[PDB]
């Protein structure tokens, strides 16, 4: 009777994968989005006699960390990072986080925020002079010139905190901001040091890395698997319906 | 879970949402209209 559950599980987890895939495709135009990878893992039931039952469960082993195609928008605050680089922004709960969205905005009082998260430099969050033109160098050096001031006063202000961390060492949080894993936190400390070897380009925005071929193939496979599991379910139900007649004396 | 093998866990997303639509305040080109009442701002400024 329980074979109608095994297949059911697969069908249900199929829907889960579909959700993940949709969550990727809804973010096809999101700047600095890292598509979540999905993977079914098989769990066998440990018990007496043959283990003729092995269920599935979906999981998301992190994200896909191949940098996307760059968007050339003529805005000096827009930045694109070298592969495996992260900007450090203060998250909601007063803690550090890593993001790839380089669309930096200037607040009314001069605070640099990415998606409302105040960017953190070498000395903490950055305070920009009131209403000034910002130019970011290839290493993160920030130069401010109150537009209209002597152009030889292009005074530097600070430097962004750019962090090197591969995709294996980082896990996503529920707010969409990436953080270090527990093992990586133990092996590389809590707060990562800024790597001066990371190059940052100003005037270009990085897009998402949602590969449409993979999404289409995943949808086709998910649909076929769902149809197979529903069929197994129908067969099992019909068999049990026929078998219930054995109790009539 | 507790850790050669792939990590476990399943963090499903929720979707997309537009947060802010921005205007690029870069100086545009100048078009010549001989009338004496049109002027063009050379830099960062707005008429009140």
């Amino acid at each position: 009777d329980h074979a109608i559950y095994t297949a059911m599980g697969a069908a249900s987890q199929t829907l889960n994968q579909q959700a993940v895939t949709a969550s990727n495709l809804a973010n096809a135009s999101t700047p600095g989005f890292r598509a979540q990878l999905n993977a079914l893992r098989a769990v066998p039931v440990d018990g007496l006699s043959l283990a003729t039952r092995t269920l599935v469960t979906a999981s998301t082993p992190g994200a896909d960390m191949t940098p996307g195609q760059l968007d050339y928008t003529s805005r000096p605050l827009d930045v694109a990072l070298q592969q495996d680089g992260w900007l450090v922004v203060q998250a909601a709960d007063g803690a550090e986080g890593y993001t790839r969205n380089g669309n930096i905005q200037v607040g009314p009082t001069g605070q640099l925020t990415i998606q409302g998260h105040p960017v953190i430099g070498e000395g903490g969050p950055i305070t920009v002079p009131e209403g000034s033109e910002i130019t970011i160098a290839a290493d993160g050096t920030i130069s401010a010139l109150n537009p209209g001031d002597p152009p030889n006063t292009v005074a530097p202000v600070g430097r962004l905190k750019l962090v090197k961390a591969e995709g294996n060492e980082v896990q996503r949080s529920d707010d969409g901001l990436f953080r270090l894993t527990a093992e990586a936190q133990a092996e590389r400390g809590a707060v990562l040091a800024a790597d001066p070897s990371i190059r940052i380009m100003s005037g270009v925005l990085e897009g998402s890395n949602v590969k449409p071929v993979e999404a289409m193939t995943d949808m086709i496979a998910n649909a076929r698997r769902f149809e197979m599991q529903m069929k197994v379910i129908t067969s099992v139900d019909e068999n049990e319906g026929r078998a219930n007649q054995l109790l009539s004396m | 879970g507790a850790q050669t093998t792939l990590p476990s866990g399943l963090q499903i997303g929720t979707g997309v949402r537009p947060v802010a639509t921005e205007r690029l305040h870069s100086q545009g080109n100048l078009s010549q209209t001989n009338n004496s009442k049109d002027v063009a701002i050379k830099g960062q400024g707005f008429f009140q």
Partner: peptide
């Protein structure tokens, strides 16, 4: 021994972990 026999001992609990402990 054979599936469907009679024994005086309850079967051990059926645990199926997701990750190796």
């Amino acid at each position: 021994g054979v599936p469907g026999a009679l024994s005086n001992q309850p079967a051990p609990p059926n645990e199926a972990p997701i990750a190796t402990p």
